[PDB]
Design a binder for this molecule. Sequence first.
Ligand code: MK9
Length: 280
Amino acid sequence: ELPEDPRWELPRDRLVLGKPLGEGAFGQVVLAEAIGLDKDKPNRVTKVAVKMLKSDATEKDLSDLISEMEMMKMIGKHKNIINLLGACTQDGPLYVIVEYASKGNLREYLQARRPPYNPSHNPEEQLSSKDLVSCAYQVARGMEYLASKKCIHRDLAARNVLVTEDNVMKIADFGLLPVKWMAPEALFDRIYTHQSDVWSFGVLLWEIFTLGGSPYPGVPVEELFKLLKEGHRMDKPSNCTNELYMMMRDCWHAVPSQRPTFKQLVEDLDRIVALTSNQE
Ligand SMILES: C=CC(=O)Nc1cccc(CN2C(=O)N(c3c(Cl)c(OC)cc(OC)c3Cl)Cc3cnc(NCCCCN(CC)CC)nc32)c1
């Protein structure tokens, strides 16, 4: 069986399992309430997300779940990633307990906040110019942290960033459609690096300032890798500054070594957030 780890072990009865949050590839996720997660305050209830194996699951799904958990232990804590909070490993089925993000993925969040095409049946308040740039900064901070711990994401996109109740951006699914976020060298040669994540961040920036737009709209998968070699880049979003468009373009450098780092992107975005007003 799985060995115990008392750094992360929470008893099974301390977890009140709630409604489904989504069905992942490795397993199913559910909303839950953890009693006495902070052992200093044992009478408190904390809303958490809980990952478990599906009904029709195999030995490969178990080892991938265990690998994700163990990877999350090593990477450590940061405000702008989904953090490991605990695990139930002993009594029966494996539960992996992580932070909960009540507002869902960044793409749907942004799409819902478009002016009333807005696909949501429940629209929300429009995001200011400073809010959009702040979102990019936080996502860059998370990636800066992940990169500093030698973690290569391999699928950074607005759909894999989650948003908390307090509107904190959190990188999701980092311890493991998609071709349009891949750098040419990842798409062609399967070479994933921190620089290929930087390319992906550029597509994520374009998602932010299109309020969750589909990149390369109407472009087939077969056409894209040719068009990227020819030097095609996405045009500036209608409601985007030239500075922020230049940042996307720098992320989309054909030569990987010429892309900025997340360290530098965080510094550039820090300056732009200060220079951007809330009145816009
Ligand atoms: C819009 C849906 C949406 O974004 N769904 C979604 C997207 C990605 C991931 C999930 C499921 N889930 C994980 O996989 N997460 C996750 C993550 Cl990101 C992870 O990467 C490090 C590792 C995990 O297990 C080890 C889990 Cl469970 C945690 C999580 C946190 N908050 C939510 N809120 C949905 C709260 C969504 C509730 N919505 C109403 C139906 C709000 C619009 N969902 C989480 C759901």
